[PDB]
Amino acid sequence: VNSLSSPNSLFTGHSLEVGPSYRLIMQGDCNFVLYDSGKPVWASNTGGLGSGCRLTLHNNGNLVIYDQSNRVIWQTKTNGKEDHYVLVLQQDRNVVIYGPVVWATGSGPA
Amino acid sequence: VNSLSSPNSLFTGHSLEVGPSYRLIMQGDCNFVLYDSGKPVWASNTGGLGSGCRLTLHNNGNLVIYDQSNRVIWQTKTNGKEDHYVLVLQQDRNVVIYGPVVWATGSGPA
Numbered sequence: 001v002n003s004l005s006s007p008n009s010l011f012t013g014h015s016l017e018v019g020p021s022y023r024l025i026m027q028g029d030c031n032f033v034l035y036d037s038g039k040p041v042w043a044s045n046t047g048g049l050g051s052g053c054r055l056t057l058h059n060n061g062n063l064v065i066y067d068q069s070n071r072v073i074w075q076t077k078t079n080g081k082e083d084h085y086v087l088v089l090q091q092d093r094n095v096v097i098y099g100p101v102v103w104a105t106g107s108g109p110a
Numbered sequence: 111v112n113s114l115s116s117p118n119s120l121f122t123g124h125s126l127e128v129g130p131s132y133r134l135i136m137q138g139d140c141n142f143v144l145y146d147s148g149k150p151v152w153a154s155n156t157g158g159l160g161s162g163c164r165l166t167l168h169n170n171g172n173l174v175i176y177d178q179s180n181r182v183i184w185q186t187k188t189n190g191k192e193d194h195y196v197l198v199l200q201q202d203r204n205v206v207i208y209g210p211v212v213w214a215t216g217s218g219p220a
C-alpha cells in the first residue's frame with residue numbers, strides 16, 4: 001500500500017511503498033524516513049527522539065508522530081476543515097497530504 | 111500501487127490494488143470496476159461502450175473515462191479549484207478522490 005487515510009496510523013516498523021525503490025517508513029527509532037533504493041531522501045529528522053512511535057493523519061489534515069508516551073514529537077501543523085484526508089507516497093516520489101473529500105464511491109468502509 | 115494522482119491516467123488493463131482482495135481496474139471493454147475477491151462491488155457501468163479506454167484524474171478534481179476516440183464516456187463532474195488531486199482505493203474498500211494539496215515533502219517529482 002502507498003497511502004494512509006485519516007484517521008488511521010502507520011505503526012512502528014511499517015511503511016508505505018511504491019515499487020521498486022520507494023519506501024516511506026515509520027521507524028522503530030521514531031524517525032519518519034523516505035528511502036530511495038536504500039538512500040534517505042527525506043525525513044522528519046526525529047530519530048532517537050523516542051521509540052514505539054506511530055504516524056497519524058487526522059481527519060482535519062494534521063499529520064503527527066506520537067512517541068510511546070503518546071506525546072507529539074513532530075507535526076505538519078496543517079489543521080483545516082474537519083472531514084477526511086489521505087497521505088500518499090507517489091510514483092513521482094513526492095509524499096503528499098490531500099483533502100478534503102471531493103468524491104467517493106461509497107464502496108467502503110466494508 | 112493503490113492511488114492515481116492528477117493529472118495522470120490509469121490505462122487499459124491496468125489497475126489499483128490493495129492486497130489481497132481489492133482490485134480497481136480500467137478494463138479493456140471500457141468498464142471501470144472494483145472487484146472484491148473476484149466479485150464486482152462497484153463500477154462506472156460503462157462496459158461495452160468503447161475500447162482502449164483510460165481513466166484520468168484532472169488537476170481540478172474531475173475524474174473521467176475516455177474512449178479510444180478520446181471522447182468522454184463517463185465522469186464524476188467534480189470540477190473544483192485548479193491544483194492537484196489523488197484517487198485512492200483504500201484498505202477499507204472505499205474509492206475516494208481527495209484534494210486539493212494540504213502539504214507536501216517536495217521529495218518529488220524526481
Ligand SMILES: CO[C@H]1O[C@H](CO)[C@@H](O)[C@H](O)[C@@H]1O
Nearest residue numbers: 005084101104108109204206
Ligand atoms: C465516511 O468515511 C468514509 O468515507 C469517506 C469519503 O466519503 C472516506 O474519506 C473515509 O476514509 C471513509 O472511507
Ligand SMILES: CO[C@H]1O[C@H](CO)[C@@H](O)[C@H](O)[C@@H]1O
Nearest residue numbers: 094096115194211214218219
Ligand atoms: C507540483 O506538483 C507536484 O507536487 C504536488 C504537491 O505540491 C503534487 O500534488 C503533485 O502530484 C506533484 O508531485
